[PDB]
Amino acid sequence: TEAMIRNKPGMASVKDMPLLQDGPPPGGFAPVRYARRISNTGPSAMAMFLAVSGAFAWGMYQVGQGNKIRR
Amino acid sequence: AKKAREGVMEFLLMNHPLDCPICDQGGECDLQDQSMAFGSDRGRFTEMKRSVVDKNLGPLVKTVMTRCIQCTRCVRFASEVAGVQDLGILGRGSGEEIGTYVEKLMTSELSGNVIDICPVGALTSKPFAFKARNWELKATETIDVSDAVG
Numbered sequence: 001t002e003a004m005i006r007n008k009p010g011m012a013s014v015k016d017m018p019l020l021q022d023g024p025p026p027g028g029f030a031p032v033r034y035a036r037r038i039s040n041t042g043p044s045a046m047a048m049f050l051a052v053s054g055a056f057a058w059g060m061y062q063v064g065q066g067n068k069i070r071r
Numbered sequence: 072a073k074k075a076r077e078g079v080m081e082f083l084l085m086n087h088p089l090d091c092p093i094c095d096q097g098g099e100c101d102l103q104d105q106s107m108a109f110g111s112d113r114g115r116f117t118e119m120k121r122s123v124v125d126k127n128l129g130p131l132v133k134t135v136m137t138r139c140i141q142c143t144r145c146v147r148f149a150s151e152v153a154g155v156q157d158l159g160i161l162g163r164g165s166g167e168e169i170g171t172y173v174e175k176l177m178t179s180e181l182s183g184n185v186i187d188i189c190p191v192g193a194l195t196s197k198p199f200a201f202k203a204r205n206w207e208l209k210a211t212e213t214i215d216v217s218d219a220v221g
């Protein structure tokens with residue numbers, strides 16, 4: 001058998017049997033990423049302290065002015 | 072020697088029907104255990120196997136002569152040990168058919184042992200029609216008490 005299970009009309013020979021099974025497409029798949037691409041594009045060490053310090057510098061002045069208005 | 076054995080076990084399994092699942096002697100088979108041990112793993116015969124009608128050999132020996140390989144063991148057992156001379160190898164070639172040429176129940180006692188003689192399911196106990204399998208049966212080496220031969 002095995003030439004009556006995989007017919008492929010013609011083929012003249014036991015080789016050239018159909019042989020259609022699963023696999024990667026011709027040319028493989030896309031290059032798959034595996035590294036750790038963690039983007040560190042956030043606020044830096046400064047700009048976070050200076051936003052906090054800047055908020056403290058101006059916002060506490062605003063607390064003071066609000067205390068003046070309340071008084 | 073091994074190539075000769077594989078050759079012959081291919082011929083035997085060539086015109087032999089795929090009756091192993093429905094064969095009563097499926098597990099306890101010389102043909103199955105010689106093919107799975109000395110015969111080739113594959114068969115190149117992809118054509119029309121020969122088939123043979125089932126002879127009526129009585130209420131003891133269920134007969135499926137298509138499975139039978141025409142090794143002649145039973146036709147010798149009935150002629151010699153059983154001594155009744157009813158079985159025969161009728162015909163020649165692949166058309167060879169083992170059994171009585173006229174419908175003739177094996178009137179001889181001692182002719183139920185042809186099933187153990189038979190290396191193939193073909194001749195099987197009709198009482199033990201299909202009720203069990205060669206692996207389920209737990210065997211005890213008992214004796215017999217029907218007749219005083221023990």
Ligand code: SF4
Binds near residue numbers: 090
């Ligand atoms: S005798 Fe029965 S079990 Fe053994 S190979 Fe033939 S069909 Fe299969």
Ligand code: SF4
Binds near residue numbers: 140143144145193194
């Ligand atoms: S013993 Fe069984 S296999 Fe051998 S010739 Fe007789 S019926 Fe056929």
